[PDB]
Design a protein around this nucleic acid. Sequence first.
RNA 1: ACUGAAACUGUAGUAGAACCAAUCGGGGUCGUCAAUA
Length: 178
Amino acid sequence: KNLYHYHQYEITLESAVDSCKNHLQAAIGLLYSPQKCELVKLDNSGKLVDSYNRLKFNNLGVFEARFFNLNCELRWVNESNGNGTAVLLSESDITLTGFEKGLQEFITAIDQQYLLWGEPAGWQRLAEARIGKLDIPLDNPLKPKDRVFLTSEEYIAEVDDFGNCAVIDERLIKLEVK
RNA sequence: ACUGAAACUGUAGUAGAACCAAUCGGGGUCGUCAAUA
């Protein structure tokens, strides 16, 4: 089994997402900025409703971003003045322009979960007295006893030539209600 | 690529129970003192 990962360097976040848009369809995304950690959803075409002004770096702009859906995850992090490295992670071999392909073999993928902050207060709201509110891109409404989880897959592979396994990556998949 | 926030080491608890400031004693009564000539 192969984990395919695609690198492009010296690329802005706005351009990195636009390069991946065919794959980041409907993808949830998390944007790290000096003052906010905002959750965003790309539309079915993989576009953001204010992508330039949201993804720019110039003024307390996004320095790191993640976007994920079922099939793939895009990661980006700033390296100089708003240019960065993009890495897209995919289960399947796919065509991208400018990106360089690579892969790593993995022994098995194991699912994980991550409970989000808050109880239920398209878009839904969780809230917790500890943090106040958290808004999540989630289309179905939430019953008062629901909790929203985030799912991921960890890929185990041999690191050492002595055969020692480790989880070489963890790709995010989707938000899920449990 | 940015300090977490907020939170009384507090609540209940008698330094107290037991232990005699007490036991015995007539306000009484006689020859001593000095050393020599």
